[PDB]
Amino acid sequence: AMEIMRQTNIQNADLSLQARSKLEEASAELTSQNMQKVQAIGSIRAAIGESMLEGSSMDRIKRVTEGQFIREANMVTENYRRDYQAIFAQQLGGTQSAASQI
Amino acid sequence: AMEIMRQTNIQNADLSLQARSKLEEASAELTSQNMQKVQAIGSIRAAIGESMLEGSSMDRIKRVTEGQFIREANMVTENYRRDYQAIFAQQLGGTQSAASQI
Amino acid sequence: AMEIMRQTNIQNADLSLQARSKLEEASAELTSQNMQKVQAIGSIRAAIGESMLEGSSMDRIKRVTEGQFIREANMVTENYRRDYQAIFAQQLGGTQSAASQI
Amino acid sequence: PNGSNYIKTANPRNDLRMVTVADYTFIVNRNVVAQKNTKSVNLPNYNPNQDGLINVRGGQYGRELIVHINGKDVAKYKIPDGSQPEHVNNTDAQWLAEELAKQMRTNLSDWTVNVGQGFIHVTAPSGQQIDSFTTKDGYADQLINPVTHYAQSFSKLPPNAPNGYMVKIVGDASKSADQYYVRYDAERKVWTETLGWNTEDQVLWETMPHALVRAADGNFDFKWLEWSPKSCGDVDTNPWPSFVGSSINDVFFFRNRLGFLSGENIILSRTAKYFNFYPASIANLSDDDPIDVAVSTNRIAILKYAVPFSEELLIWSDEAQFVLTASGTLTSKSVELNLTTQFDVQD
Amino acid sequence: NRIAILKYAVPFSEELLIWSDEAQFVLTASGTLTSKSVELNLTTQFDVQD
């Protein structure tokens, strides 16, 4: 039973390490989408500053593309949170089966 | 037999959680196709409003593309319903085999 | 032996359900190729009607593209029939091995 | 119908400028300014606080449920971790909700509690709001998602909801780019964007341009056109038309869209529907959006008149003349204004 | 912008011309004439009679 608890806890720590790697690669994905967002919104300013349109509807389009990037960021972080739910629940269920056999 | 009932029921609850995930990601797919549909039908209204065609045949082409997107939505929800049939029948068969061994 | 025959028959009914899903998704593939075919042959009529060439050779080219799509349909239905042969023969071999063990 | 007050002026000629497009000839008074109608707000003071939807999701068997109500725990039930095939009912959606909701009723009746196939709804307590709504049931909250009225994305919005509701999806507070309001309508399972909390949807109407139309009976009716309600969330995100302070100086049907030349703004109504002036939809650009543009140039310029022409409207202003030209679908994206002449004009 | 009865039409070749009482419009489509490409233009304004 000591070997069993040690093995299940090592698997749990492995899963937590997986969660760490997942969060940091999600951070690398978020920052890459950011690195795309900066260029995009820079292009958009450039456009607006050059045509003399100067309008609320013109600002509206800037806000539209900004909301697009924000939505993608939200999709990315929701993906991360779902993966976290998956791995947590998985380690939980494993610990439960091991506890029942114990 | 108690351990067996509990294990099969935990697997069934896992499958139900899976069904919940399937439905919400299907909702995220439907809403994304919607987010495409809005831009498409906006472009179509722009076209029709600008050419002075003023025709039922134009109205027909708008209805054609609208039906395109509606068929697409029906396709994705049919995919979801087939996946639901699959997972339900799978958990049912598993419970049946466990009941026979019990 | 009763459990064995029940299990093999449940697997066979699962395979028949797979055959049902296969035929209906093949129907959805055929109808989609049809939905492409209608647009294609409409474009072809438009072309032929426009020029005033009035040629048997243009009738020939229309028949050529029509035969293209017909061969495509025959290809997909042949794929379906091969898959049906595969699943049938598979369930037959399984039932045979189970019968030998019985 | 609806009076004839708008037409009156001391000098009819200078002030009443009009255009004609068959069914409805639009008569627009230069003199009378528009006003937002604040006596008709859609959402008076939507109480964001009162209602929370306890999401009903999968149980996960043994993981117990603790659901704080108004920050106070009253919802405690632990799923019977019993093997029995009959015992498996312990986790289905309706039953779990019932267990939890009746329990909410026991603690206090100030808030009314309900069961829905997908949800448990707290009716607003009459004077006391949910000061804070939180819950940690199960390891990852995989059973109950508190949803509130504010959430992170298109995701995390409950699947079934009451016949009317409001959810504002916000990316972050400082940038309002992704803010829009979503309402669930029950009859068709759908979620739609309807105007959000506390913003009125209509100008006073009377003050706006009135329209002269001809009845089918051969007599003519002066009438107030039914200008469109905005139907989008928040005052800031769906900008007020912005001709409201100003007189509507001339009215013009450039392209197919209706248009008002305002004090400094070409407010052009959505291009293919004549009267839906406010932005059609908040978070997805639609080229059938109206174009509200101001010709800043380098000198604030009032826009005195406009001439429709064909492919491109010309805008004449006191100290310069500018041409707005877009061959492609006239859209907010392609306006392309040019300042190309400098002769003067007078009143 | 004005309901116009269409009095006559003249076939021509590439593009039919439509003559109406108060304006003359040309329907032109070089590509396959289709609902998609009609492209009507109002380009002249002389009058016609019955």
Which pair of tokens denotes residue B45? 């209204």
CA neighbor of C94 nearest in space, from C31, C2, C10, C3:
C10
Taking a C-beta distance cutoff of 8 angstroms, is the pair D40, D204 a contact?
no
CB E38 within 8 A of CB B56: no
Show which subunits contact D, needing at least 3 CB pairs below 8 angstroms: A, B, E
Whether chain C lies against chain B with 3 or more Cβ pairs closer than 8 A is yes
Query: Which residue among B3, B10, B21 sits closest to A93, beta carbon to beta carbon?
Result: B10
Q: DSSP character for D5?
A: G
State whether residue D265 is helix, strand or coil. Answer: strand
Q: Would you say D180 and D194 are in contact if contact means Cβ atoms under 8 Å apart?
A: no
| Token digits of residue D229 | 């309600």
Instruction: Give the angle subtended at the CA of D191 by the CAs of D41 and B82, to the nearest 5°.
Output: 175
Min Cα–Cα distance to chain B from E50, Å: 25
Kind and range of the H or E run holding D224: strand D220-224
Q: Dihedrals φ, ψ of D70, to 5°?
A: 60, 30
Q: Which residues pair with D69 in a beta bridge?
A: D72
- Taking 3-state DSSP, the helix, strand and coil percentages for chain E, each rounded to the nearest 5, stand at 0, 35, 65
Q: Which of C10, C21, C28 has the CB atom closest to B93's CB atom?
A: C10
Return the H-helix or E-strand segment holding E19: strand E15-19
Helix (H, G, I), strand (E, B) or coil at E9: strand
Contacts of B6 in chain A (CB under 8 A): 100
Residue identified by tokens 């304006």 is E23
Please, which residues have CB within 8 angstroms of residue D160's CB and are 6 or more apart in sequence? D116, D117, D118, D119, D189
Which residue among E35, E36, E40 places its CB closest to the CB of B52? Answer: E40
Q: Do A89 and B17 touch (CB under 8 A)?
A: yes
Q: What letter represents residue D94's amino acid?
A: Q
Q: Find the CB nearest A67 among D139, D177, D295.
A: D177
Instruction: Tell me the residue type at C21.
Output: S
- D313 phi and psi angles, rounded to 5 deg: -70, 150
The reported resolution of this PDB entry, expressed in Å, is 4.3
| One-character DSSP codes across D147-209 | --SEESSSSSS-SS--SS--EEE-S-SS--TT-EEEEEETTTTEEEE---TT----B-STTS-
Helix axes B2-51, A56-101, angle to 10 degrees: 170
d(CA C12, CA C22): 15
Q: Please, are residues D281 and D323 in contact by the beta-carbon 8 Å criterion?
A: no
Chains B and A touch (3+ CB pairs under 8 A): yes
**3-state secondary structure at position D46:** coil
Q: What technique determined this structure? A: cryo-EM
How far apart CA D95 and CA B25 sit, in angstroms, is 25
Note the helical H segments in chain D: 12-15, 93-107
Query: Taking phi first (over 0 means left), then psi (-120 to 50 degrees means alpha), and beta for anything else, what does residue D146 get?
Result: beta
C-alpha distances (whole Å) from D60 to each of A84, B18, C11, D56 are: 16, 11, 29, 12
Q: Which run of H or E residues covers position A36?
A: helix A2-51
Chain D residues closer than 8 Å to A96 by CB: 62
State the number of CA atoms in the 13 A half-sphere of D290 facing the CB: 28
- For residue E1, the chain D residue with the least C-alpha distance is D21
Q: Which two tokens stand for residue B12?
A: 């069934």
- Using a CB-CB distance cutoff of 8 angstroms, which residues of chain E are in contact with residue D253? 1
Sign of CA dihedral D320, D326, D332, D334: negative
Return the closest-CA partner of residue B44 out of D287, C51, A19. Answer: D287
Query: Shortest Cα distance from E32 to chain B (angstroms)?
Result: 16
Q: How far is C40 from chain E (nearest CA, A)?
A: 13
Cα–Cα distance between D89 and A77 in angstroms, integer? 33
Which runs of consecutive H residues, i.e. helices, occur in E1-50? Answer: none
Which residues neighbour A69 within 8 Å (Cβ) at sequence distance 6 or greater?
Answer: A33, A36, A37, A40, A41
Using a CB-CB cut-off of 8 Å, the residues of chain D touching B12 are 88
In angstroms, the CA D262 to CA D241 distance is: 10
Distance CA D4, CA B54 (A): 33
Chain E: give the shortest CA distance to residue C36, in Å.
18
In which element (H, E) is residue C22 found?
Answer: helix C2-51
Smallest Cβ–Cβ distance between B46 and the set D59, D85, D331 belongs to D331
- β-pairing, D167-169 vs D150-151, is parallel
Q: Hey, is the C-beta of B48 within 8 angstroms of any chain E C-beta? A: no
Instruction: Please say whether the beta carbons of D167 and D179 come within 8 A.
Output: no
Backbone φ, ψ for residue B75 (5° rounding): -60, -45
Other Cβ atoms closer than 10 A to B57: 12
Give B-chain residues touching A93 at CB under 8 angstroms: 10, 14
Chain B environment of D254 (Cβ under 8 Å)? none
Is the pair E, A in contact (3+ CB pairs within 8 Å)?
A: no
Whether D253 and E1 lie within 8 Å, measured CB to CB? yes
> Which tokens is C15 given?
């395979």
One-letter amino acid at B30 equals L
CB distance D175 to A68 below 8 Å: no
Q: Which chains touch B (3 or more CB pairs under 8 A)?
A: A, C, D, E
Decide if A32 contacts A76 (C-beta within 8 A): no
